[PDB]
Amino acid sequence: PGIVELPSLEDLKVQEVKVSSSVLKAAAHHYGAQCDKPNKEFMLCRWEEKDPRRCLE
């Protein structure tokens, strides 16, 4: 069959949120309230595209 297409290692490079799990849990609700629109857009794209390679941006 066809060759599986995978994005290069430069495309995946991004500065990650390097905090612990308890740091995320302590500020979970304000993060959900304030940053709601890009997370909602990303997860709608994830549920509509069914492909992690098409939801990178």
């Binding site: 609700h29 993060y31 997370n39």
Partner: protein, 70 residues
């Protein structure tokens, strides 16, 4: 003479009958006590379980907020 004899008036009383004092409460009292304990436990459990359900809902919505970054 000197022998082992009872005194002139005899000895004291000596019991030979079964003695069971019948100590305790009636059945209505203990049954009512048990029913009251059951009702108090049920009320306390209803309050604590409702509070625990609210706490679980709060934790779940915290995970909902944290999901997209993960």
């Amino acid at each position: 003479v000197k022998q082992d004899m009872p005194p002139v008036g005899g000895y004291g009383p000596i019991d030979y009958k079964r003695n069971l004092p019948r100590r305790g409460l009636s059945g209505y009292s203990m049954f009512a006590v048990g029913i009251g304990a059951l009702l108090f436990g049920y009320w306390s459990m209803m309050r604590w379980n409702r509070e625990r359900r609210r706490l679980q809902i709060e934790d779940f919505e915290a995970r909902i907020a944290l999901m997209p970054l993960l």
